[PDB]
Design an enzyme around this catalytic site. Structure first.
Site, short mmCIF file in Angstrom:
data_model
loop_
_atom_site.label_atom_id
_atom_site.label_comp_id
_atom_site.label_asym_id
_atom_site.label_seq_id
_atom_site.Cartn_x
_atom_site.Cartn_y
_atom_site.Cartn_z
CE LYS A 160 7.27 2.79 6.04
NZ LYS A 160 5.80 2.59 6.14
CB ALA A 170 -0.91 0.00 1.22
N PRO A 171 1.46 1.59 -1.16
CG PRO A 171 2.50 1.38 -3.21
CD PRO A 171 1.29 0.91 -2.46
N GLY A 172 2.30 4.96 -0.24
CA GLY A 172 1.66 6.19 0.20
C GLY A 172 2.58 7.16 0.90
CG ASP A 192 7.58 0.27 2.70
OD1 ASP A 192 6.66 1.11 2.82
OD2 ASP A 192 8.02 -0.10 1.59
CG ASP A 222 -2.27 -0.05 -3.99
OD1 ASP A 222 -2.87 -1.12 -3.79
OD2 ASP A 222 -2.40 0.95 -3.25
CB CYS A 231 5.00 -2.79 12.00
SG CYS A 231 5.40 -1.05 11.68
#
Length: 305
Positions: free
Chosen positions: A130, A126-128, A192, A148, A237
């Protein structure tokens, strides 16, 4: 593990397996990490240097009554200590002068340190946030490829990028696992994972395996399209060694790569569950909710040989 701490972990929602695992990894600190993780995180923001300097933005917000502290690992990041009114209701936010995201999410882009003119890829599902950070660090020069599978989300992201004045991102409606089909050689790669792992905690051993496998697949595809001497930053995470240290050790054993030193956080684990890993893994870092006021976080900087 005493009956007391065990019961406390069980009440927080942990299975006896995970409770035993966390105690084996951190001992009594296990309870402190688990409890610290139940608390809400402060609201943090990143100054969009594509539109305004950090010095100027700070003066503008302070004048309006907002107060904040610096995020150690990101010069453009700050976390609110005084939010008179909603920060998202400010002209600063509405005109793209700042972007709201967790402090930990600011570390990966900064660690990757993309330079103007480089060919970069964000392999996020989910690119955004960062992705736009990479863009300002590159000063709208170079190129950033992102993927995405969700068109609606991709459309939303394209609007955010427009508000931020980002001009060097290319968004593809596909999974980053197909990155190899572009036949492009990358200078930098950001791998990520969504901040929803064991580090977020508001899972099963199976869920950990699924993510570990997917992580391994993603890391291999990323290293594959990376130029020799290129850099890939891997982050999650999750608190689980299987999704962190184990994947990095596998990469060190499986590919021609080396880890580079990272400054913030605590050293990654080199003896999780009594399993001796390469001392080189100490170059990797971990952020803990009991000391860094972030979700459980893991990050490693890899250089391709």
């Amino acid at each position: 593990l005493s009956p007391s701490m065990l019961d406390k972990l069980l009440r927080l929602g942990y299975s006896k397996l995970f409770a035993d695992r966390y105690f084996q990894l951190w001992g009594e600190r296990a309870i402190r990490i688990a409890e610290a993780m139940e608390k809400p995180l402060p609201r943090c923001f990143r100054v969009n240097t594509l539109k305004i300097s950090v010095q100027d933005l700070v003066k503008r917000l302070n004048k309006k009554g907002f107060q904040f502290k610096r995020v150690p690992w990101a010069k453009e990041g700050f976390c609110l200590t005084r939010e008179p009114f909603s920060i998202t209701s400010t002209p600063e936010f509405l005109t793209g002068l700042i972007y709201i995201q967790e402090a930990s999410s600011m570390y990966p882009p900064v660690a990757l340190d993309p330079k103007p003119g480089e060919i970069v890829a964000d392999m996020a599902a989910a690119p955004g946030g960062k992705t736009s950070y990479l863009a300002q660090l590159m000063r709208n020069d170079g190129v950033i490829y992102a993927f995405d599978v969700d068109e609606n989300r991709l459309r939303e992201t394209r609007l955010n990028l427009s508000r931020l004045g980002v001009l060097n991102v290319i968004l593809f409606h596909s999974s980053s696992l197909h990155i190899g089909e572009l036949n492009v050689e990358f200078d930098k790669i950001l791998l990520d994972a969504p901040c929803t792992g064991s580090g977020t905690i508001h899972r099963t051993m199976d869920d950990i395996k699924f993510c570990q496998g997917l992580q391994m697949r993603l890391l291999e595809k990323g290293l594959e399209v990376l130029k020799p001497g290129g850099i890939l930053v891997y982050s999650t995470c999750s608190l689980e060694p299987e999704e962190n240290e184990f994947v990095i050790q596998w990469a060190l054993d499986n590919f021609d790569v080396e880890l580079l030193p990272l400054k913030y956080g605590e050293p990654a684990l080199t003896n999780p569950f009594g399993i001796e890993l390469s001392e080189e893994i100490k170059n990797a870092r971990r952020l803990y909710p009991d000391v860094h006021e972030t979700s459980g976080f893991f990050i490693a900087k890899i250089r391709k040989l």
